[PDB]
Design a binder for these strands. Structure first.
Ligand SMILES: *[C@@H]1O[C@H](CO)[C@@H](O[C@@H]2O[C@H](CO)[C@@H](O[C@@H]3O[C@H](CO)[C@@H](O)[C@H](O)[C@@H]3O)[C@H](O)[C@H]2NC(C)=O)[C@H](O)[C@H]1NC(C)=O
Ligand SMILES: *[C@@H]1O[C@H](CO)[C@@H](O[C@@H]2O[C@H](CO)[C@@H](O[C@@H]3O[C@H](CO)[C@@H](O)[C@H](O)[C@@H]3O)[C@H](O)[C@H]2NC(C)=O)[C@H](O)[C@H]1NC(C)=O
Ligand SMILES: *[C@@H]1O[C@H](CO)[C@@H](O[C@@H]2O[C@H](CO)[C@@H](O[C@@H]3O[C@H](CO)[C@@H](O)[C@H](O)[C@@H]3O)[C@H](O)[C@H]2NC(C)=O)[C@H](O)[C@H]1NC(C)=O
Ligand SMILES: *[C@@H]1O[C@H](CO)[C@@H](O[C@@H]2O[C@H](CO)[C@@H](O)[C@H](O)[C@H]2NC(C)=O)[C@H](O)[C@H]1NC(C)=O
Length: 170
RNA sequence: AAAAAAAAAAAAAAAAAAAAAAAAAAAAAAAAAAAAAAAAAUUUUUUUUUUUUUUUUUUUUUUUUUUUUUUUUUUUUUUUU
């Protein structure tokens, strides 16, 4: 679809919505703030698709109202930002992360400490850099089961990386 | 009482020529020093500009194989309008 962007009360009234797909829907969503998904405050969403939406920047607390959100898809986008952890603020019980197929995703020591209840995490084709800092960004995470960092040209990995990820299987 | 010649002692003052010394200043010659400086012969750091080797990401191009559709020119054959 070709909707420019959402409004304050676009999705207001959906008190039972749990499956939402917005793939290749928004063309004027270059920058994401915390006033986009405000309409879904009362929606117990479980799946969220946002691929091919030309997402390039998200603000702190954008998904704060998505407390019950478990599945999110931000792949196939043009994200150009520095991860700090506050981008995933408000995710009380999140299941997995879809941020593959990007061009720049810089990781920090606290980029993922806010949400430690993940299950899967793949960063395929994101060109991530500077993951040599200690402690590792994945240290707080405990229930990761699938971890993919392929097609990103990892410069270096140290001993502190992949520490304590006992639950990992793939 | 006083004045003078030969012979002998002389005490003081003003000058000088020498010897033995001693402080003071000024000249040099050697042993050191503290330095603000100067190079030269051995180690190496940081930064800028660039060379070579090696491992990989993105994009583009060539070829081969497989496969889905828009068009088809053929129809060996089958009942026919
Ligand atoms: C959505 O994103 C905007 C943009 O970052 C957030 O606005 C920012 O909010 C912080 C926190 O309040 C502000 O920092 C501090 O604000 C207080 C006033 O509350 C002020 O006294 C401090 O000096 C400091 O500035 C920040 O200025 C503000 N920035 C902008 C551009 O608005 C907003 O809070 C976010 N909302 C949610 C729900 O996440
Ligand atoms: C948002 O919607 C899109 C479109 O429906 C979903 O894309 C689909 O994603 C799945 C899983 O990534 C794809 O399945 C896999 O496809 C690859 C080829 O890309 C194949 O090699 C695998 O064996 C597997 O079949 C699926 O093809 C793909 N469909 C389309 C039309 O792109 C996307 O998953 C949705 N995001 C969600 C649900 O979070
Ligand atoms: C969204 O949240 C992140 C994480 O809280 C914010 O990043 C944080 O920004 C502050 C203010 O710049 C940083 O504090 C200072 O950082 C400098 C280094 O940039 C450091 O030298 C100072 O001593 C001080 O700590 C904080 O470190 C930084 N945190 C992280 C994890 O990056 C970001 O500003 C927020 N953005 C918005 C729009 O609200
Ligand atoms: C990490 O995974 C474990 C195992 O799935 C989680 O423990 C479960 O937590 C739920 C909800 O709190 C309980 O209903 C289950 O009974 C727990 N299972 C076990 C075997 O203990 C744990 O909560 C996860 N960690 C985080 C931070 O979410």
């Amino acid at each position: 679809n070709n909707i420019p962007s959402t409004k304050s009360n676009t999705f207001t009234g959906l008190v039972s919505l749990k499956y939402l797909s917005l793939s290749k829907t928004f063309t004027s969503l270059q920058t994401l703030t915390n006033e986009t998904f405000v309409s879904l405050a009362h929606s117990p969403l479980l799946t969220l698709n946002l691929t091919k939406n030309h997402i390039s920047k998200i603000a702190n607390g954008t998904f704060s109202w998505l407390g019950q959100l478990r599945i999110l898809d931000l792949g196939l986008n043009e994200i150009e930002q520095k991860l700090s952890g506050q981008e995933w603020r408000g995710l009380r019980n999140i299941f997995e992360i879809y941020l593959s197929y990007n061009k720049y995703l810089q990781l920090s020591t606290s980029s993922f400490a806010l949400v430690p209840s993940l299950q899967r995490l793949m960063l395929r084709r994101v060109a991530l850099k500077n993951v040599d800092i200690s402690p590792s960004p994945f240290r707080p995470l405990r229930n990761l089961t699938i971890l993919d960092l392929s097609n990103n040209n990892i410069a270096n990995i140290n001993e502190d990386l992949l520490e304590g990820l006992e639950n990992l299987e793939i």
